[PDB]
Design a protein around this ligand. Sequence first.
Ligand SMILES: [Mg+2]
Ligand SMILES: [Mg+2]
Ligand SMILES: [Mg+2]
Ligand SMILES: [Mg+2]
Ligand SMILES: [Mg+2]
Ligand SMILES: [Mg+2]
Ligand SMILES: [Mg+2]
Ligand SMILES: [Mg+2]
Ligand SMILES: [Mg+2]
Ligand SMILES: [Mg+2]
Ligand SMILES: [Mg+2]
Ligand SMILES: [Mg+2]
Ligand SMILES: [Mg+2]
Ligand SMILES: [Mg+2]
Ligand SMILES: [Mg+2]
Ligand SMILES: [Mg+2]
Ligand SMILES: [Mg+2]
Ligand SMILES: [Mg+2]
Ligand SMILES: [Mg+2]
Ligand SMILES: [Mg+2]
Ligand SMILES: [Mg+2]
Ligand SMILES: [Mg+2]
Ligand SMILES: [Mg+2]
Ligand SMILES: [Mg+2]
Ligand SMILES: [Mg+2]
Ligand SMILES: [Mg+2]
Ligand SMILES: [Mg+2]
Ligand SMILES: [Mg+2]
Ligand SMILES: [Mg+2]
Ligand SMILES: [Zn+2]
Lengths: 135, 251, 77, 96, 112, 91
Amino acid sequence: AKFLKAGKVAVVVRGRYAGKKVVIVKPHDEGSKSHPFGHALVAGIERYPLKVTKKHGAKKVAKRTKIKPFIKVVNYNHLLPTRYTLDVEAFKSVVSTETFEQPSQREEAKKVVKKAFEERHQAGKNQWFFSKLRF
Amino acid sequence: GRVIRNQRKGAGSIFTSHTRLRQGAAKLRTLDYAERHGYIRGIVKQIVHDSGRGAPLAKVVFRDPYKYRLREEIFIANEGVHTGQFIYAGKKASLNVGNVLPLGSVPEGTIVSNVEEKPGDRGALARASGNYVIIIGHNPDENKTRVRLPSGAKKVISSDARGVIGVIAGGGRVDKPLLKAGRAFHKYRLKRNSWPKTRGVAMNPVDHPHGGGNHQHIGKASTISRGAVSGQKAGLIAARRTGLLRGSQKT
Amino acid sequence: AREITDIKQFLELTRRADVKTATVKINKKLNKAGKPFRQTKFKVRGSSSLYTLVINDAGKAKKLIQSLPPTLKVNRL
Amino acid sequence: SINQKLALVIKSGKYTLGYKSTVKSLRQGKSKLIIIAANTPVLRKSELEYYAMLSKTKVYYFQGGNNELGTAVGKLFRVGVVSILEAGDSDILTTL
Amino acid sequence: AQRVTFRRRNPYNTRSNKIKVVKTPGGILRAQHVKKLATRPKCGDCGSALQGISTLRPRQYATVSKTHKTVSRAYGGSRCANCVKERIIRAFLIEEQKIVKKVVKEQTEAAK
Amino acid sequence: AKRTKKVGITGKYGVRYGSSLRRQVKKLEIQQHARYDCSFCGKKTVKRGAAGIWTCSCCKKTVAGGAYTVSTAAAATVRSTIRRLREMVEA
RNA sequence: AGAACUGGUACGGACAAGGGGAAUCUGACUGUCUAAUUAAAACAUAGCAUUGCGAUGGUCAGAAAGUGAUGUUGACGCAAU
RNA sequence: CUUGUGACGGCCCGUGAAAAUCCACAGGAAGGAAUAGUUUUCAUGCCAGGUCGUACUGAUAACCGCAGCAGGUCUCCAAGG
RNA sequence: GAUGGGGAAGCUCCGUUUCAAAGGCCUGAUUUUAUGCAGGCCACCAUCGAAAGGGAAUCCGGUUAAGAUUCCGGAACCUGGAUAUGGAUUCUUCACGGUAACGUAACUGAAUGUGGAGACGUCGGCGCGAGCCCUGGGAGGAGUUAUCUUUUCUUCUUAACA
Ligand SMILES: [Mg+2]
Ligand SMILES: [Mg+2]
Ligand SMILES: [Mg+2]
Ligand SMILES: [Mg+2]
Ligand SMILES: [Mg+2]
Ligand SMILES: [Mg+2]
Ligand SMILES: [Mg+2]
Ligand SMILES: [Mg+2]
Ligand SMILES: [Mg+2]
Ligand SMILES: [Mg+2]
Ligand SMILES: [Mg+2]
Ligand SMILES: [Mg+2]
Ligand SMILES: [Mg+2]
Ligand SMILES: [Mg+2]
Ligand SMILES: [Mg+2]
Ligand SMILES: [Mg+2]
Ligand SMILES: [Mg+2]
Ligand SMILES: [Mg+2]
Ligand SMILES: [Mg+2]
Ligand SMILES: [Mg+2]
Ligand SMILES: [Mg+2]
Ligand SMILES: [Mg+2]
Ligand SMILES: [Mg+2]
Ligand SMILES: [Mg+2]
Ligand SMILES: [Mg+2]
Ligand SMILES: [Mg+2]
Ligand SMILES: [Mg+2]
Ligand SMILES: [Mg+2]
Ligand SMILES: [Mg+2]
Ligand SMILES: [Zn+2]
């Protein structure tokens, strides 16, 4: 059974965001006119949150938990699907094929996905997704 | 008379070895806590030819357990080692080719090379191409091992000395005839100034004990006692026997 | 040593507060086998580099020399 | 042996040859079984088991290298991995 | 058929003293010394000439902007792109195998 | 066509150095210059770089081996002995 | 590459440019030396053979040393014939 | 023709320097904005760059051979037939 | 080839990291005030040794009785140092685009570690470049011309740097 679904977490192996965790929001198996190849609409994080200890108080925590997300079209050949998962509901609407093709909705979609990511990271959800892949 | 050639080497004026192109002293990893209590892992990076040496070098990279650095070691490559191969050194290492098990923890009949004569001296025995050592047996009490050197001599060494598993690569080197004074010239050009060699009998008597005479002949006996002094030791020193070897060595 | 192709950039560059002199060179060129035209070159000696502006139109050349600041030393050659 | 089953797969069923083709097929969920040559790059091997486990696909390891696997499927070149898209008339899927 | 001479005081045809005969607006032939050719940077893993990077003599790199000396990927000016891909793959797979090994080990110890 | 009867590769040494020496030099140079299988990539792309260094043009792997061949008989015997000792000591 | 025609049979027209063969002694060969009388059949050489040595060692140096060469070496090595 | 350079191939029991120096990456210590900052690997702008050699010959006359000696003395460029 | 050391009656000898208590590096704190305390860091451990090895950065034209890549004129570059403006970026604080190889005017980054360049044999052939040689047309000048010769010779060039 096919596994690249609308909630899988993958790792980009090629491109500017190589080694960055991404979550698939909208798959496209049989390519498209603009992309004649199996591609997806993943959303990821560019600047992973920093480590936080007890010592930091009330502002270094805030500064060290900043998240920089990104949205991109990526070929399936440039992803490693994982056995992990992370559901996407709050920002599956904003990420779409016409979300791209002009800069604005890209940036206010990045804002929404940033909010969703930081909200989940504030709670104890998906530590592996927010943990930096060291290599 | 004049100081003969063999005396003249000790001064080391032009008789020192030519060491420009050598990649470094081929020594084992220093014996530390990790090796004598466990095992450590390494990666083979380069297999390099050593100038003036028949065997190739193995350049293995290790991790410093105490500081964040990348200690790099130079081994003598055993036949069968490849780049990117993981190398395990230590007491609890698995008995695999290229591993550096101490002679105490290795069963009889094993083949090892680059063997230490004392623990921690980083490899003395069997360091030439195609050479190896047989482990004959152990003495568990007062830990001690008996091994066979390439010379055929049997030697008893400590069980905590180390030695890499396998045979030194480059065997069969001396099989091909050189055919050319040029080949020997280039061979010795990177070892030391010891070629060509002039026959002592073709020398004037001031130059060598054999020199002189209306015919090229040694004159006296050529077997020289070990009690002779420098300048007399020219020929067969302390020869137990001489002549063609007909029969078994009976060693 | 650096060529400039923007007239607005050139006129702005004439007011860089460091340039003291400039020269105007007139050349006779051939667009093709039949028609010779007059080439004009505007060279402004900057502090670190020489900026050359080339104009192939006589009318634009006249309007531009008319539009140079009076405080700039111009050389005709 | 097993090479006779492979040959009957080739003459009857459908298959793919090569790492890119097999990973593409396994990504789409069309692959029923994969065969890995003995000396396949172990990293490539490992990503292959990971992909198969993600896709719930049986895995078998050929007792031979690229040349032996290539001759097994009846091709004059060397094959590192083969994917089984449909048995056709064979029995490999049921056994092993 | 003019014949040129070295423009400096080193008369020996050495590597640092290579010349290229060139013609000047004065109409004469004058020899000009050319600097030693730049060697392309190489990857740390695959050993091949990694692309996208300007090739200059080592000191001359201090003069150019950051763009010419890097690529916009992790390990930009250091490692081959395929090297980066394969090392990312290796890292992921070995870490997942580490979780697999630890769960197997805790299972087997819990069994006994 | 066939250019030589017996000298083969050692025709470059002409009429000198003696017949027998040229004979075993031929016997060794044939092994030295031959192409060998890649134990990793499975191709006829392994060549000798220097004495004892055997590397593969494709797959960029280098293996320490014999000075004149990829592996000598003594190496094979040693490897078999090591395998025997491993499977004897682990079980 | 070929064919006619032509000249006091000339024509690689100056320059440039191997004499050859039948044998014997001796050294296998390339190479090196008696600058300024001897270039050889002398020396070296590859090959062959012998000897010593497992490092607290063999060979050699220094007056001595908390000293050295072989040795960034380990018998497929080093050293002496 | 000379020379530079690229991809190659042949050869080795020969695989054919080191250091100064410059850069990149990994790393995330530290510092950072909204009525205002952060930035000098982007552009433009300002100042300084010390000390010693610098002529000529380089050879049948400038060097050594007692000398204005047919000797010796490292190297670069090389037209036409 | 000094030093620590060790020999030698001694002139001196060995040895160059050796049985050594072998140091400077950045940030800041204090603004009696200059710099000690606040820290942290780090472990080679003198020096000399190439006018052909490595090496930051310049070319063209002209000028003298004799100097020039050095002088004059013009046009650049490097290093070191201060700095101001413009540009860039930020309310998602430390940029974006491309599936990708990767692109741009920029587009924080200490300790520490890794890598690259420096950095490399010889020969044979092939491709490519530059200069030279050959040659056509044309625009000038010179030579031969009893006879022939759209003829013989000669000038038509473009540096570093962007
Ligand atoms: Mg000699
Ligand atoms: Mg004599
Ligand atoms: Mg005597
Ligand atoms: Mg005698
Ligand atoms: Mg120089
Ligand atoms: Mg780039
Ligand atoms: Mg570029
Ligand atoms: Mg003489
Ligand atoms: Mg003579
Ligand atoms: Mg003789
Ligand atoms: Mg000794
Ligand atoms: Mg030449
Ligand atoms: Mg070559
Ligand atoms: Mg001068
Ligand atoms: Mg002068
Ligand atoms: Mg002169
Ligand atoms: Mg001269
Ligand atoms: Mg001269
Ligand atoms: Mg004189
Ligand atoms: Mg001294
Ligand atoms: Mg110096
Ligand atoms: Mg120099
Ligand atoms: Mg060099
Ligand atoms: Mg220049
Ligand atoms: Mg002059
Ligand atoms: Mg000037
Ligand atoms: Mg931008
Ligand atoms: Mg390098
Ligand atoms: Mg031009
Ligand atoms: Zn291979």
